[PDB]
Amino acid sequence: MRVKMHVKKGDTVLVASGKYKGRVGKVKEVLPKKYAVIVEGVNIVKKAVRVSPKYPQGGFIEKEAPLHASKVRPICPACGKPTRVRKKFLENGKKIRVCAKCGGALD
Amino acid sequence: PKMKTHKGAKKRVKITASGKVVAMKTGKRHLNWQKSGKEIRQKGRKFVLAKPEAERIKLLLPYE
Amino acid sequence: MKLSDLRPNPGANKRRKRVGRGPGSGHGKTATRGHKGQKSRSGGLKDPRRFEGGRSTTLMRLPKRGMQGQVPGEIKRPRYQGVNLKDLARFEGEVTPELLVRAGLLKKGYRLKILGEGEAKPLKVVAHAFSKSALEKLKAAGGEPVLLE
Amino acid sequence: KGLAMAVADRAREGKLLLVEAFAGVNGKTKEFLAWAKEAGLDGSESVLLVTGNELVRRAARNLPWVVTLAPEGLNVYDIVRTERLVMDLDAWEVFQNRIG
RNA sequence: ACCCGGUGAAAUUGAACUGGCCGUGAAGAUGCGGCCUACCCGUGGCAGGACGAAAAGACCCCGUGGAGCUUUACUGCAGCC
RNA sequence: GGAUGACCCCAGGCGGUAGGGGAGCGUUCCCGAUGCCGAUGAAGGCCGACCCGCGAGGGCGGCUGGAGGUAAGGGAAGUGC
RNA sequence: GCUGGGGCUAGGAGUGAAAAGCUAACCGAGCCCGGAGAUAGCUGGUUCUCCCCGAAAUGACUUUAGGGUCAGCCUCAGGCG
RNA sequence: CUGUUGGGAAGCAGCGCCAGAGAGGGUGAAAGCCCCGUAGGCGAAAGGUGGGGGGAUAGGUGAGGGUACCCGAGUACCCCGUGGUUCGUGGAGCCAUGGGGGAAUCUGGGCGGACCACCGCCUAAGGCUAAGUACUCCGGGUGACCGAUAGCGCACCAGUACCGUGAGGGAAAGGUGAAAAGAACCCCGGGAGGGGAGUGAAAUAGAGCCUGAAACCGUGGGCUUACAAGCAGUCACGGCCCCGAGGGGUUGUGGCGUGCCUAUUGAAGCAUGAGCCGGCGACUCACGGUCGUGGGCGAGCUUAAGCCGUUGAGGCGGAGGCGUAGGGAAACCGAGUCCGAACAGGGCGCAGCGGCCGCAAAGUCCGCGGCCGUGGACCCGAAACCGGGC
RNA sequence: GGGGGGAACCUGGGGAACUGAAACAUCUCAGUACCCAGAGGAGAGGAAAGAGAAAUCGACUCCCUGAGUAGCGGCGAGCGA
RNA sequence: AGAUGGUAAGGGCCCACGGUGGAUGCCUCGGCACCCGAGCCGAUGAAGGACGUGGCUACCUGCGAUAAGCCAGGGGG
Ligand SMILES: [Mg+2]
Ligand SMILES: [Mg+2]
Ligand SMILES: [Mg+2]
Ligand SMILES: [Mg+2]
Ligand SMILES: [Mg+2]
Ligand SMILES: [Mg+2]
Ligand SMILES: [Mg+2]
Ligand SMILES: [Mg+2]
Ligand SMILES: [Mg+2]
Ligand SMILES: [Mg+2]
Ligand SMILES: [Mg+2]
Ligand SMILES: [Mg+2]
Ligand SMILES: [Mg+2]
Ligand SMILES: [Mg+2]
Ligand SMILES: [Mg+2]
Ligand SMILES: [Mg+2]
Ligand SMILES: [Mg+2]
Ligand SMILES: [Mg+2]
Ligand SMILES: [Mg+2]
Ligand SMILES: [Mg+2]
Ligand SMILES: [Mg+2]
Ligand SMILES: [Mg+2]
Ligand SMILES: [Mg+2]
Ligand SMILES: [Mg+2]
Ligand SMILES: [Mg+2]
Ligand SMILES: [Mg+2]
Ligand SMILES: [Mg+2]
Ligand SMILES: [Mg+2]
Ligand SMILES: [Mg+2]
Ligand SMILES: [Mg+2]
Ligand SMILES: [Mg+2]
Ligand SMILES: [Mg+2]
Ligand SMILES: [Mg+2]
Ligand SMILES: [Mg+2]
Ligand SMILES: [Mg+2]
Ligand SMILES: [Mg+2]
Ligand SMILES: [Mg+2]
Ligand SMILES: [Mg+2]
Ligand SMILES: [Mg+2]
Ligand SMILES: [Mg+2]
Ligand SMILES: [Mg+2]
Ligand SMILES: [Mg+2]
Ligand SMILES: [Mg+2]
Ligand SMILES: [Mg+2]
Ligand SMILES: [Mg+2]
Ligand SMILES: [Mg+2]
Ligand SMILES: [Mg+2]
Ligand SMILES: [Mg+2]
Ligand SMILES: [Mg+2]
Ligand SMILES: [Mg+2]
Ligand SMILES: [Mg+2]
Ligand SMILES: [Mg+2]
Ligand SMILES: [Mg+2]
Ligand SMILES: [Mg+2]
Ligand SMILES: [Mg+2]
Ligand SMILES: [Mg+2]
Ligand SMILES: [Mg+2]
Ligand SMILES: [Mg+2]
Ligand SMILES: [Mg+2]
Ligand SMILES: [Mg+2]
Ligand SMILES: [Mg+2]
Ligand SMILES: [Mg+2]
Ligand SMILES: [Mg+2]
Ligand SMILES: [Mg+2]
Ligand SMILES: [Mg+2]
Ligand SMILES: [Mg+2]
Ligand SMILES: [Mg+2]
Ligand SMILES: [Mg+2]
Ligand SMILES: [Mg+2]
Ligand SMILES: [Mg+2]
Ligand SMILES: [Mg+2]
Ligand SMILES: [Mg+2]
Ligand SMILES: [Mg+2]
Ligand SMILES: [Mg+2]
Ligand SMILES: [Mg+2]
Ligand SMILES: [Mg+2]
Ligand SMILES: [Mg+2]
Ligand SMILES: [Mg+2]
Ligand SMILES: [Mg+2]
Ligand SMILES: [Mg+2]
Ligand SMILES: [Mg+2]
Ligand SMILES: [Mg+2]
Ligand SMILES: [Mg+2]
Ligand SMILES: [Mg+2]
Ligand SMILES: [Mg+2]
Ligand SMILES: [Mg+2]
Ligand SMILES: [Mg+2]
Ligand SMILES: [Mg+2]
Ligand SMILES: [Mg+2]
Ligand SMILES: [Mg+2]
Ligand SMILES: [Mg+2]
Ligand SMILES: [Mg+2]
Ligand SMILES: [Mg+2]
Ligand SMILES: [Mg+2]
Ligand SMILES: [Mg+2]
Ligand SMILES: [Mg+2]
Ligand SMILES: [Mg+2]
Ligand SMILES: [Mg+2]
Ligand SMILES: [Mg+2]
Ligand SMILES: [Mg+2]
Ligand SMILES: [Mg+2]
Ligand SMILES: [Mg+2]
Ligand SMILES: [Mg+2]
Ligand SMILES: [Mg+2]
Ligand SMILES: [Mg+2]
Ligand SMILES: [Mg+2]
Ligand SMILES: [Mg+2]
Ligand SMILES: [Mg+2]
Ligand SMILES: [Mg+2]
Ligand SMILES: [Mg+2]
Ligand SMILES: [Mg+2]
Ligand SMILES: [Mg+2]
Ligand SMILES: [Mg+2]
Ligand SMILES: [Mg+2]
Ligand SMILES: [Mg+2]
Ligand SMILES: [Mg+2]
Ligand SMILES: [Mg+2]
Ligand SMILES: [Mg+2]
Ligand SMILES: [Mg+2]
Ligand SMILES: [Mg+2]
Ligand SMILES: [Mg+2]
Ligand SMILES: [Mg+2]
Ligand SMILES: [Mg+2]
Ligand SMILES: [Mg+2]
Ligand SMILES: [Mg+2]
Ligand SMILES: [Mg+2]
Ligand SMILES: [Mg+2]
Ligand SMILES: [Mg+2]
Ligand SMILES: [Mg+2]
Ligand SMILES: [Mg+2]
Ligand SMILES: [Mg+2]
Ligand SMILES: [Mg+2]
Ligand SMILES: [Mg+2]
Ligand SMILES: [Mg+2]
Ligand SMILES: [Mg+2]
Ligand SMILES: [Mg+2]
Ligand SMILES: [Mg+2]
Ligand SMILES: [Mg+2]
Ligand SMILES: [Mg+2]
Ligand SMILES: [Mg+2]
Ligand SMILES: [Mg+2]
Ligand SMILES: [Mg+2]
Ligand SMILES: [Mg+2]
Ligand SMILES: [Mg+2]
Ligand SMILES: [Mg+2]
Ligand SMILES: [Mg+2]
Ligand SMILES: [Mg+2]
Ligand SMILES: [Mg+2]
Ligand SMILES: [Mg+2]
Ligand SMILES: [Mg+2]
Ligand SMILES: [Mg+2]
Ligand SMILES: [Mg+2]
Ligand SMILES: [Mg+2]
Ligand SMILES: [Mg+2]
Ligand SMILES: [Mg+2]
Ligand SMILES: [Mg+2]
Ligand SMILES: [Mg+2]
Ligand SMILES: [Mg+2]
Ligand SMILES: [Mg+2]
Ligand SMILES: [Mg+2]
Ligand SMILES: [Mg+2]
Ligand SMILES: [Mg+2]
Ligand SMILES: [Mg+2]
Ligand SMILES: [Mg+2]
Ligand SMILES: [Mg+2]
Ligand SMILES: [Mg+2]
Ligand SMILES: [Mg+2]
Ligand SMILES: [Mg+2]
Ligand SMILES: [Mg+2]
Ligand SMILES: [Mg+2]
Ligand SMILES: [Mg+2]
Ligand SMILES: [Mg+2]
Ligand SMILES: [Mg+2]
Ligand SMILES: [Mg+2]
Ligand SMILES: [Mg+2]
Ligand SMILES: [Mg+2]
Ligand SMILES: [Mg+2]
Ligand SMILES: [Mg+2]
Ligand SMILES: [Mg+2]
Ligand SMILES: [Mg+2]
Ligand SMILES: [Mg+2]
Ligand SMILES: [Mg+2]
Ligand SMILES: [Mg+2]
Ligand SMILES: [Mg+2]
Ligand SMILES: [Mg+2]
Ligand SMILES: [Mg+2]
Ligand SMILES: [Mg+2]
Ligand SMILES: [Mg+2]
Ligand SMILES: [Mg+2]
Ligand SMILES: [Mg+2]
Ligand SMILES: [Mg+2]
Ligand SMILES: [Mg+2]
Ligand SMILES: [Mg+2]
Ligand SMILES: [Mg+2]
Ligand SMILES: [Mg+2]
Ligand SMILES: [Mg+2]
Ligand SMILES: [Mg+2]
Ligand SMILES: [Mg+2]
Ligand SMILES: [Mg+2]
Ligand SMILES: [Mg+2]
Ligand SMILES: [Mg+2]
Ligand SMILES: [Mg+2]
Ligand SMILES: [Mg+2]
Ligand SMILES: [Mg+2]
Ligand SMILES: [Mg+2]
Ligand SMILES: [Mg+2]
Ligand SMILES: [Mg+2]
Ligand SMILES: [Mg+2]
Ligand SMILES: [Mg+2]
Ligand SMILES: [Mg+2]
Ligand SMILES: [Mg+2]
Ligand SMILES: [Mg+2]
Ligand SMILES: [Mg+2]
Ligand SMILES: [Mg+2]
Ligand SMILES: [Mg+2]
Ligand SMILES: [Mg+2]
Ligand SMILES: [Mg+2]
Ligand SMILES: [Mg+2]
Ligand SMILES: [Mg+2]
Ligand SMILES: [Mg+2]
Ligand SMILES: [Mg+2]
Ligand SMILES: [Mg+2]
Ligand SMILES: [Mg+2]
Ligand SMILES: [Mg+2]
Ligand SMILES: [Mg+2]
Ligand SMILES: [Mg+2]
Ligand SMILES: [Mg+2]
Ligand SMILES: [Mg+2]
Ligand SMILES: [Mg+2]
Ligand SMILES: [Mg+2]
Ligand SMILES: [Mg+2]
Ligand SMILES: [Mg+2]
Ligand SMILES: [Mg+2]
Ligand SMILES: [Mg+2]
Ligand SMILES: [Mg+2]
Ligand SMILES: [Mg+2]
Ligand SMILES: [Mg+2]
Ligand SMILES: [Mg+2]
Ligand SMILES: [Mg+2]
Ligand SMILES: [Mg+2]
Ligand SMILES: [Mg+2]
Ligand SMILES: [Mg+2]
Ligand SMILES: [Mg+2]
Ligand SMILES: [Mg+2]
Ligand SMILES: [Mg+2]
Ligand SMILES: [Mg+2]
Ligand SMILES: [Mg+2]
Ligand SMILES: [Mg+2]
Ligand SMILES: [Mg+2]
Ligand SMILES: [Mg+2]
Ligand SMILES: [Mg+2]
Ligand SMILES: [Mg+2]
Ligand SMILES: [Mg+2]
Ligand SMILES: [Mg+2]
Ligand SMILES: [Zn+2]
């Protein structure tokens, strides 16, 4: 019915695996069809660009490459640790994500 | 499917206790007027079929 | 005793015969069928238990004998099974048809007839029939023949 | 005869163990785990645990070295697959009735 | 048709380093024996051989194979009496 | 001989179509396996004048390959051109 | 007489100035799908290895004769000796 | 969680933790604890279902005695022709009915295998009726199921392209990489293509993309060959080249030497088949039978359908089957029986080892193997025959 | 209210042949293939003018068994309650 | 007089590297079997289609001149 995403634009994530294991950053974008996220300044790649109006002088640009969403973990804004998410039902009762290490909301 | 008893053999033949096959002597159905009494009398007995012929008839009687 | 130890006894599981698989096996090419003719063909011969190449068969030249029966079929009549004295040896006290069925000696649907192989034992034996010598041996051993009807 | 021989085989090895009850095991893995350690089952040897106590089967089932069964289910492949046989007396009771 | 530039099939093909004679051989041999002859590789041509190619001979026989047709063959049916 | 299919010794048999029988090899899959081998490199491919086996085969090494494979003992077949 | 267009007649049926002609490039019974894996006592083909043994091409009968049944001859297991 | 190798950790190492969850799939490789899940729980305003629970309604319910009114008609019944049944004209009943004839209302009628009697069974000629049963377009679960020549005809835009007037026939065709980072820019070229540069762990992973066999085509090198006779090899020796009392490659001379398969009395055969290579390609399965064999039990052995349980757990179930007695067409008798006058003769039948204990066995059940029967029954092949359509 | 559709399944109305019988006609294949009508989530059948020997049972359907029995059968091949 | 080597137009064997080609292994969006579930639609016009429908649209999917969609309830975040 919908792809499940534990992370979203733009909470703060630890990149927990791959060349950039350890980095922290904001999620610029979430791509559910690919099950991927863009994290700011993580997975940079060099891309060739043709001499074009969009890019006179041509040469190359840097692009951020998507990461498999499973490589990424939200950092709790209360306790500051990378966490799994739990859901908690409020009194509304809307439901929310909460850090699983302490109890804080993650938004 | 299961084998069928051959009814023509069931009607001509009997398997004895030890598995020989037994049948009536042939040759007094008719044309008997000039047959001696020794002949008619002896054709009145049962006989034990030759082994190869009996073994064949036996397989036609799987449930006797 | 563990799973890796579980084995069939020698000979308990034999290999099948595979034909038409190469010369070394000694069953290649013709697959043990020989050359040509009906028996080598898929489908093979006629029923070898009966057929004899076109001549009147061994079986069919022998005379039929006796009552073969007519529609509407077998005529319902009481059927008797005999069980000898020796088979009664194991019981003590009484024997009746029902008992003998249980012990696996008398088949259901058959009336009981006692027969004379063996020695009689002084029991009360209840049954639909007795042979002459069964009656004698039983009467003599002090047993009690009771006739059902 | 097969059932009986299989149990017999573990018996002859010392690997068959009968127990009266299961201490504190009330459906939690760590509970069975404790009891097990105390019962001589460190999990270095695989165990076919046979008992009618559902609470005990749930507690043990997830352990990689444990196969669980109700006593009505005792069968020779499972006995032969495992290194040690552990039974309730109530279990041992039905097995005795089945091999009778 | 031939030669040069351009494009470029085919059936067939166990593999082949594939001569002649007299013999031999399942009775018509490049392939076996003995001899004779013969440097290596093509191009245009000829058709004697490769029992050349094509088509599991159509004649012939065989199969308790098939089909069309016939009749005072057998058996039945329509139709008609 | 020794006790038992442990291996030694003496002797004899061992051409083979149809065909009978015996013993094995390898392929796919299952139990073994929540195990074990594996990026310090799976399967598969290409080499080898090496090792074991009568053989079918199995090892071992080098190169390729880049993610699988699967023992001892058993089980079952879409099993060998 | 020839010809355009529009129609009708078909499978043991049509149609035929008759050739068993034609009925969609093979008509002594069209084509498609189905019974269907018809049947083929005929031809072809039948796939790893090693070891032991090892035939027959006769007789009788056979709508049989290049097909079968029995016997003979091969082979295995048990018994006798 | 950390460290470590690595492009990447989930690998290895250190120290931990969860488990009613260690099914399984992903994530840069091999992860219980990262993701999706899993065990265990929860959930519908609306539509559908509702065979379960509750309620209503329709509908249901007496005994003697008398009367002899009613109780399914072109029907029963008989005959003729047929079909159905195991029943093919048979001693042929029963059920059904095309033709003819043609009743009765229980003191009526049909049936129990021609018919008759007796003794029983049952109520024709009006209708309805859940469930237990069949199937699988559809959804889900699961495989000692396939893995792109397989598996559906189709993994892909396939009942498509294409073929046929039409009915109808009917394909081929999957895979870069972890990520497009899918190669800016320069150089040669009209372009295609390439060479650099760049990306990537890897680019003979560059899109004509994983692996990348074989036939087939080529470049380079070693050895060899233009007086030689050939199923192409083999044995010997010698020369040259290579790797280092040896091996490998090559082949001058000498010796020997009639392809494979098939079919045949007999083939190198001038008899069949094959251009070469890769892939597909033929003795099986079920049920019965017969022998053999590995076990279990043994005068006994064994369960089927089902039911309970499980959710890759087994149990129950004795109806039934085989065996325990044969002989006889049968009545029937029975260790005998049949033929016969026979107490004659004959046919076909009947009769463990050790020390009460063990041991073996009849037999029977299951497994395995050979062969047999029924199926298309080892695979491929007709000409034909039949049905329905075009 | 009907009409038309639906992969199999179902009932009813019609209904082959190859083949087997080692020829073939009765017989088999088979009331199968197939055409048609109709139903439905099932359909059919169903509450004895039954069975058939038990002094018995008690609608129908469906499975196991009875049983390859009883029988049927150019008493053949086979068919089969 | 005698005798013995370097020729290779081309060919043959071997070795290396390629080209062609698409086997094999691994892979799986798909298939297959069994079991369970579930089982009618249509004149209120079905099944199945034609033609349309996007700012730019060949095809597929979706949809019907209200045309990749309109209204409302529920779910979800
Ligand atoms: Mg959610
Ligand atoms: Mg770090
Ligand atoms: Mg909400
Ligand atoms: Mg007969
Ligand atoms: Mg006579
Ligand atoms: Mg006569
Ligand atoms: Mg007479
Ligand atoms: Mg007479
Ligand atoms: Mg005289
Ligand atoms: Mg006289
Ligand atoms: Mg007389
Ligand atoms: Mg029987
Ligand atoms: Mg008997
Ligand atoms: Mg086997
Ligand atoms: Mg072989
Ligand atoms: Mg053999
Ligand atoms: Mg042989
Ligand atoms: Mg051959
Ligand atoms: Mg043979
Ligand atoms: Mg044979
Ligand atoms: Mg042959
Ligand atoms: Mg022969
Ligand atoms: Mg042959
Ligand atoms: Mg022949
Ligand atoms: Mg033969
Ligand atoms: Mg053959
Ligand atoms: Mg043949
Ligand atoms: Mg055939
Ligand atoms: Mg045949
Ligand atoms: Mg009889
Ligand atoms: Mg007394
Ligand atoms: Mg466990
Ligand atoms: Mg285990
Ligand atoms: Mg010139
Ligand atoms: Mg030219
Ligand atoms: Mg050559
Ligand atoms: Mg020459
Ligand atoms: Mg001559
Ligand atoms: Mg010649
Ligand atoms: Mg000559
Ligand atoms: Mg010559
Ligand atoms: Mg030669
Ligand atoms: Mg010559
Ligand atoms: Mg010569
Ligand atoms: Mg000459
Ligand atoms: Mg020339
Ligand atoms: Mg010429
Ligand atoms: Mg010419
Ligand atoms: Mg020639
Ligand atoms: Mg010529
Ligand atoms: Mg010619
Ligand atoms: Mg030719
Ligand atoms: Mg031909
Ligand atoms: Mg010919
Ligand atoms: Mg000919
Ligand atoms: Mg002629
Ligand atoms: Mg001739
Ligand atoms: Mg002829
Ligand atoms: Mg004839
Ligand atoms: Mg003939
Ligand atoms: Mg003929
Ligand atoms: Mg004819
Ligand atoms: Mg007229
Ligand atoms: Mg030999
Ligand atoms: Mg042997
Ligand atoms: Mg063998
Ligand atoms: Mg091995
Ligand atoms: Mg193999
Ligand atoms: Mg093997
Ligand atoms: Mg499998
Ligand atoms: Mg596993
Ligand atoms: Mg594994
Ligand atoms: Mg390791
Ligand atoms: Mg690495
Ligand atoms: Mg390596
Ligand atoms: Mg492998
Ligand atoms: Mg594999
Ligand atoms: Mg090797
Ligand atoms: Mg390798
Ligand atoms: Mg994997
Ligand atoms: Mg394995
Ligand atoms: Mg194994
Ligand atoms: Mg096993
Ligand atoms: Mg095969
Ligand atoms: Mg005109
Ligand atoms: Mg005109
Ligand atoms: Mg016209
Ligand atoms: Mg006209
Ligand atoms: Mg006309
Ligand atoms: Mg017409
Ligand atoms: Mg027409
Ligand atoms: Mg016709
Ligand atoms: Mg006509
Ligand atoms: Mg004309
Ligand atoms: Mg046409
Ligand atoms: Mg035509
Ligand atoms: Mg024409
Ligand atoms: Mg013509
Ligand atoms: Mg014709
Ligand atoms: Mg015709
Ligand atoms: Mg059709
Ligand atoms: Mg047929
Ligand atoms: Mg067939
Ligand atoms: Mg024929
Ligand atoms: Mg023929
Ligand atoms: Mg074969
Ligand atoms: Mg010999
Ligand atoms: Mg002869
Ligand atoms: Mg004879
Ligand atoms: Mg004759
Ligand atoms: Mg004759
Ligand atoms: Mg012959
Ligand atoms: Mg013949
Ligand atoms: Mg013989
Ligand atoms: Mg002899
Ligand atoms: Mg013999
Ligand atoms: Mg012997
Ligand atoms: Mg590092
Ligand atoms: Mg780590
Ligand atoms: Mg660790
Ligand atoms: Mg689990
Ligand atoms: Mg797992
Ligand atoms: Mg996993
Ligand atoms: Mg691991
Ligand atoms: Mg693994
Ligand atoms: Mg995991
Ligand atoms: Mg649940
Ligand atoms: Mg759940
Ligand atoms: Mg009254
Ligand atoms: Mg009245
Ligand atoms: Mg009435
Ligand atoms: Mg009326
Ligand atoms: Mg009548
Ligand atoms: Mg009839
Ligand atoms: Mg009759
Ligand atoms: Mg009748
Ligand atoms: Mg009538
Ligand atoms: Mg009356
Ligand atoms: Mg009356
Ligand atoms: Mg009546
Ligand atoms: Mg009547
Ligand atoms: Mg009557
Ligand atoms: Mg009756
Ligand atoms: Mg009645
Ligand atoms: Mg009705
Ligand atoms: Mg109900
Ligand atoms: Mg029903
Ligand atoms: Mg179902
Ligand atoms: Mg499904
Ligand atoms: Mg797979
Ligand atoms: Mg493919
Ligand atoms: Mg395919
Ligand atoms: Mg492939
Ligand atoms: Mg599909
Ligand atoms: Mg295909
Ligand atoms: Mg395809
Ligand atoms: Mg297409
Ligand atoms: Mg056409
Ligand atoms: Mg067209
Ligand atoms: Mg066609
Ligand atoms: Mg094709
Ligand atoms: Mg990829
Ligand atoms: Mg990809
Ligand atoms: Mg990677
Ligand atoms: Mg330019
Ligand atoms: Mg370019
Ligand atoms: Mg360039
Ligand atoms: Mg470039
Ligand atoms: Mg780089
Ligand atoms: Mg690396
Ligand atoms: Mg490479
Ligand atoms: Mg690559
Ligand atoms: Mg390619
Ligand atoms: Mg890959
Ligand atoms: Mg490639
Ligand atoms: Mg390539
Ligand atoms: Mg190559
Ligand atoms: Mg060269
Ligand atoms: Mg000279
Ligand atoms: Mg020279
Ligand atoms: Mg030589
Ligand atoms: Mg020498
Ligand atoms: Mg050398
Ligand atoms: Mg040399
Ligand atoms: Mg020679
Ligand atoms: Mg030669
Ligand atoms: Mg020769
Ligand atoms: Mg060969
Ligand atoms: Mg050939
Ligand atoms: Mg020939
Ligand atoms: Mg010939
Ligand atoms: Mg000849
Ligand atoms: Mg030759
Ligand atoms: Mg030649
Ligand atoms: Mg010829
Ligand atoms: Mg030739
Ligand atoms: Mg020929
Ligand atoms: Mg060709
Ligand atoms: Mg070639
Ligand atoms: Mg090949
Ligand atoms: Mg076989
Ligand atoms: Mg067997
Ligand atoms: Mg057995
Ligand atoms: Mg047992
Ligand atoms: Mg039986
Ligand atoms: Mg006597
Ligand atoms: Mg015993
Ligand atoms: Mg036994
Ligand atoms: Mg046999
Ligand atoms: Mg069949
Ligand atoms: Mg077959
Ligand atoms: Mg067969
Ligand atoms: Mg055919
Ligand atoms: Mg024709
Ligand atoms: Mg005809
Ligand atoms: Mg005709
Ligand atoms: Mg027709
Ligand atoms: Mg027609
Ligand atoms: Mg209608
Ligand atoms: Mg309808
Ligand atoms: Mg009907
Ligand atoms: Mg009608
Ligand atoms: Mg009909
Ligand atoms: Mg007709
Ligand atoms: Mg016929
Ligand atoms: Mg047929
Ligand atoms: Mg037959
Ligand atoms: Mg026939
Ligand atoms: Mg025939
Ligand atoms: Mg004929
Ligand atoms: Mg016929
Ligand atoms: Mg047939
Ligand atoms: Mg019929
Ligand atoms: Mg019908
Ligand atoms: Mg059908
Ligand atoms: Mg309808
Ligand atoms: Mg239902
Ligand atoms: Mg109903
Ligand atoms: Mg109804
Ligand atoms: Mg009523
Ligand atoms: Mg019976
Ligand atoms: Mg019939
Ligand atoms: Mg020179
Ligand atoms: Mg040269
Ligand atoms: Mg040159
Ligand atoms: Mg050469
Ligand atoms: Mg290459
Ligand atoms: Mg695999
Ligand atoms: Mg539906
Ligand atoms: Mg529509
Ligand atoms: Mg559209
Ligand atoms: Mg809106
Ligand atoms: Mg809404
Ligand atoms: Mg809403
Ligand atoms: Zn926190």
From Swiss-Prot, chain A:
InterPro entries, alphabetized: KOW, Rib_uL2_dom2, Ribosomal_uL24, Ribosomal_uL24_CS, Ribosomal_uL24_KOW, Translation_prot_SH3-like_sf
Keyword rRNA-binding (UniProt): yes
Gene Ontology molecular function: rRNA binding; structural constituent of ribosome
Keywords: Ribonucleoprotein, Ribosomal protein, RNA-binding, rRNA-binding
Source organism: Thermus thermophilus (strain ATCC 27634 / DSM 579 / HB8)
Superkingdom per UniProt: Bacteria
The keyword Ribonucleoprotein is assigned to this record: yes
Function, in words: One of two assembly initiator proteins, it binds directly to the 5'-end of the 23S rRNA, where it nucleates assembly of the 50S subunit. One of the proteins that surrounds the polypeptide exit tunnel on the outside of the subunit.
UniProt GO cellular component terms: ribonucleoprotein complex; ribosome
Subunit structure: Part of the 50S ribosomal subunit.
Family under the similarity heading: Belongs to the universal ribosomal protein uL24 family.
Pfam families: KOW (PF00467), ribosomal_L24 (PF17136)
Protein name in the entry: Large ribosomal subunit protein uL24
Cited HAMAP family: Ribosomal_uL24_B
A biological process from GO: translation
From Swiss-Prot, chain B:
Transmembrane segments: none
Protein name, entry field: Large ribosomal subunit protein bL35
PANTHER family: 54S RIBOSOMAL PROTEIN BL35M, LARGE RIBOSOMAL SUBUNIT PROTEIN BL35M
Quaternary organization: Part of the 50S ribosomal subunit.
Gene3D superfamilies linked to this entry: 4.10.410.60
Key word Ribonucleoprotein present: yes
InterPro entries assigned: Ribosomal_bL35, Ribosomal_bL35-like, Ribosomal_bL35_CS, Ribosomal_bL35_sf
Gene: rpmI
Keywords: Ribonucleoprotein, Ribosomal protein
Keyword Nucleus: no
GO molecular function: structural constituent of ribosome
Any one of the GO BP annotations: translation
Family stated for the protein in its record: Belongs to the bacterial ribosomal protein bL35 family.
Signal peptide: none
CC terms in the record's Gene Ontology section: cytosolic large ribosomal subunit
Swiss-Prot record, chain C:
A cellular component annotation (GO) from this entry: cytosolic large ribosomal subunit
Region (Disordered): 1-60
UniProt biased composition (Basic residues): 30-39
PROSITE patterns according to UniProt: RIBOSOMAL_L15 (PS00475)
One Pfam family of this chain: Ribosomal_L27A
GO biological process, one term: translation
Gene3D superfamilies noted in UniProt: 3.100.10.10
Keyword terms, alphabetized: Ribonucleoprotein, Ribosomal protein, RNA-binding, rRNA-binding
Record's keyword annotation contains Ribosomal protein: yes
GO molecular function list: rRNA binding; structural constituent of ribosome
Biased composition (Basic and acidic residues): 44-53
InterPro entries listed in its UniProt record: Ribosomal_uL15 (IPR030878), Ribosomal_uL15/eL18 (IPR021131), Ribosomal_uL15/eL18_sf (IPR036227), Ribosomal_uL15_bac-type (IPR005749), Ribosomal_uL15_CS (IPR001196)
PANTHER family: 50S RIBOSOMAL PROTEIN L15, LARGE RIBOSOMAL SUBUNIT PROTEIN UL15M
NCBIfam families: rplO_bact
Quaternary state and interactors: Part of the 50S ribosomal subunit.
Summary of the function given for this chain in its UniProt record: Binds to the 23S rRNA.
Family: Belongs to the universal ribosomal protein uL15 family.
Record's protein name: Large ribosomal subunit protein uL15
GN (gene name): rplO
From Swiss-Prot, chain D:
Keyword annotations from UniProtKB, A to Z: Ribonucleoprotein, Ribosomal protein, RNA-binding, rRNA-binding
Top-rank taxon, per record: Bacteria
Post-translational modification: The N-terminus is blocked.
Gene Ontology CC terms: ribonucleoprotein complex; ribosome
GO-annotated molecular function: rRNA binding; structural constituent of ribosome
Any single GO BP term: translation
Function (record text): One of the primary rRNA binding proteins, this protein initially binds near the 5'-end of the 23S rRNA. It is important during the early stages of 50S assembly. It makes multiple contacts with different domains of the 23S rRNA in the assembled 50S subunit and ribosome.
Subunit structure, as described in the record: Part of the 50S ribosomal subunit.
Similarity comment: Belongs to the universal ribosomal protein uL4 family.
Name of the protein this chain belongs to: Large ribosomal subunit protein uL4
Species annotation: Thermus thermophilus (strain ATCC 27634 / DSM 579 / HB8)
Origin organism lineage: Bacteria, Thermotogati, Deinococcota, Deinococci, Thermales
Gene: rplD
From-to range in the entire protein, with total length: 108 to 207 of 210
